[PDB]
Scaffold this motif. Sequence first.
Motif: not given
Length: 336
Positions: A222-224, A249-252, A275-281
């Motif tokens: 799902l997330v690539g 795998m690409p992100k859907m 995927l990146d905990s740094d970018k996650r809301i």
Amino acid sequence: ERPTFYRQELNKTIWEVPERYQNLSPVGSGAYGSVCAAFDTKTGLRVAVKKLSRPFQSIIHAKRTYRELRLLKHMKHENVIGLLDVFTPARSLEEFNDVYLVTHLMGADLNNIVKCQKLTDDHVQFLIYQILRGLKYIHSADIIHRDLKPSNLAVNEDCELKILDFGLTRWYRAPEIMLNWMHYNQTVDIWSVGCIMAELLTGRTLFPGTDHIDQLKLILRLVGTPGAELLKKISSESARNYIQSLTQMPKMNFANVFIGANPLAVDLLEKMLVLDSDKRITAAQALAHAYFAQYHDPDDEPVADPYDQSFESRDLLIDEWKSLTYDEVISFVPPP
Ligand SMILES: Cc1ccc(C(=O)Nc2ccon2)cc1NC(=O)c1cnn(-c2ccccc2)c1N
């Protein structure tokens, strides 16, 4: 002590509680303390009573007992389970070997709701909003739930939610905490919220992994697969070796995954399932998202008073953890 305690055998164990707590009936357990549903004679209310399992029989248990009681005594929030009472049949520190914790008895958990129903969008908004409102408060005291899942999210329907086993099961875990803690923050709980929200909107588990490798495969479809930018930030050799070995795998697009869902729900899901905990809301940012415009009140989303958790760094003896827990039992004052 001051109340009269009465003994009975519940499950394959001896329960010794005050006379105010009547008609004790088992609910469930795990490996830390089974709970009984009970009736409070004094308040006329149904309560949940937890007997801690062998609280001071090991160093891990003794510190865990202290941790749990400190967590419970500190958190005062609407969406966070709260302590009504804490007792022991013991009259002194020498005979102290049992701890009982009393909270409200909730009607159902989030697994129950999704089985008997296909939730509506306002239903999802209110549930997710409440979980986020509780996590903002938890996260502000510098506590991560770390094991957020539908079984520790309970409702007293109505539809009013309480978060259960916060500061100390595979389908709701952040990928960074799956393949050895390659650096992590509080959004580890946000990934879990994303998984819960997606399951509330579709009626199905987002990633029902059969093992820890199959779980990662499901997440990544799902997330690539991790990109260039993310791979650069991974210091663990074995984790980088593992990531590099998987077929790209690409992100859907979540709009083609969550067919028919509110577009604002889809946008929010994309922000949480990054995927990146740094970018996650974060919890506070997610509460400001447009999906919650009906519920969001920046004046009604409080933060926690400062919480001293220096004890977490301390390596003490079983009897020191016991005495420290004993002080938290004696010093306790109900909400009321
Ligand atoms: C008695 C108790 C003691 C401690 C905690 C707790 O959360 N502890 C910790 C530890 C760290 O942070 N918090 C919760 C409870 N209450 C319940 O477990 C509880 C209350 N209602 N339901 C319920 C009843 C029926 C259906 C669904 C839920 C439950 N499962």
